[PDB]
Amino acid sequence: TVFRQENVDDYYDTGEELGSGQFAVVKKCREKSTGLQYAAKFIKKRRTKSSRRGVSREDIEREVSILKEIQHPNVITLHEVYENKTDVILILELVAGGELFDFLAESLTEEEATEFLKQILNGVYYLHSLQIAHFDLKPENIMLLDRNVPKPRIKIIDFGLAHKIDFGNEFKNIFGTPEFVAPEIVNYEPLGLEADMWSIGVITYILLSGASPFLGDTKQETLANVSAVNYEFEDEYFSNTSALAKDFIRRLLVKDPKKRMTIQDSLQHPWIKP
Numbered sequence: 571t572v573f574r575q576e577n578v579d580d581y582y583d584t585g586e587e588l589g590s591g592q593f594a595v596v597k598k599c600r601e602k603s604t605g606l607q608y609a610a611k612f613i614k615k616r617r618t619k620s621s622r623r624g625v626s627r628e629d630i631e632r633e634v635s636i637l638k639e640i641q642h643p644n645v646i647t648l649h650e651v652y653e654n655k656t657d658v659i660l661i662l663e664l665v666a667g668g669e670l671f672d673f674l675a676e677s678l679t680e681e682e683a684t685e686f687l688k689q690i691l692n693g694v695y696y697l698h699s700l701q702i703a704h705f706d707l708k709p710e711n712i713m714l715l716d717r718n719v720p721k722p723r724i725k726i727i728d729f730g731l732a733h734k735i736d737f738g739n740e741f742k743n744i745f746g747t748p749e750f751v752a753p754e755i756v757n758y759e760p761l762g763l764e765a766d767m768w769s770i771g772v773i774t775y776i777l778l779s780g781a782s783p784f785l786g787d788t789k790q791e792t793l794a795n796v797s798a799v800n801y802e803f804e805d806e807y808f809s810n811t812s813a814l815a816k817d818f819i820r821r822l823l824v825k826d827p828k829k830r831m832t833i834q835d836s837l838q839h840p841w842i843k844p
């Protein structure tokens with residue numbers, strides 16, 4: 571699919587940088603015709619077929635195709651796409667409240683944690699209902715709308731690893747951040763919606779304790795810990811956390827993806843359900 575090849579600068583003015591990655595950067599921007607504000611993601615294209623710099627057009631198109639499908643209060647949405655010889659430029663919904671991750675650096679109560687968690691689950695329920703696996707859920711990819719409120723509103727961002735799961739599983743090598751990837755990712759096994767549910771378990775553990783369940787001193791140690799389900803609830807961190815909260819985490823951090831709670835299970839779990 572080809573995108574708008576007019577100069578994006580004829581239609582938008584850019585401002586503050588919001589984020590920066592290996593082959594992309596996100597700038598706050600303002601559309602000239604409406605004064606409305608967005609987040610412009612500049613993705614560097616591959617210059618040759620066999621290079622490893624830039625993002626393959628297949629991977630860019632996958633992200634765009636998935637984003638075009640999305641309309642939900644807890645997931646980022648796409649406004650427009652432009653391109654030129656060097657970049658594809660996604661004009662995305664503006665989220666300006668910073669990362670959940672940076673909000674966390676400022677441990678949550680269970681009520682505060684579930685406040686965020688419920689929005690994350692609602693977002694994921696929407697995605698999984700559309701057979702979309704995110705594959706990169708972590709605190710850095712949970713963004714706030716306004717960070718200066720009691721219960722901030724969140725949007726799930728970063729669909730750079732997201733895949734449609736048309737057969738209940740995809741077999742692709744889809745490798746994100748060791749701390750947050752499920753054992754099937756570590757082991758290069760077929761992957762499905764279940765991988766996201768593991769990531770939610772890791773996020774929940776961190777929300778409640780400020781500690782990462784599988785984090786080792788090196789990436790290989792972290793990955794080995796994940797594959798072995800090498801985690802425990804440290805009393806120093808969890809002594810005043812309810813056993814039901816621990817139960818919720820325990821049913822997500824399960825090696826066999828078939829035995830892991832699904833997104834529907836997680837919404838009906840007694841810790842979450844009203």
Ligand SMILES: O=S(=O)(O)c1cccc2cccc(Nc3ccccc3)c12
Nearest residue numbers: 588589590591594595596609611727728
């Ligand atoms: O996840 S995106 O949907 O692009 C996204 C959407 C909206 C706002 C974003 C702000 C900062 C970083 C992003 N991600 C990002 C990803 C890769 C490189 C640089 C930034 C934001």
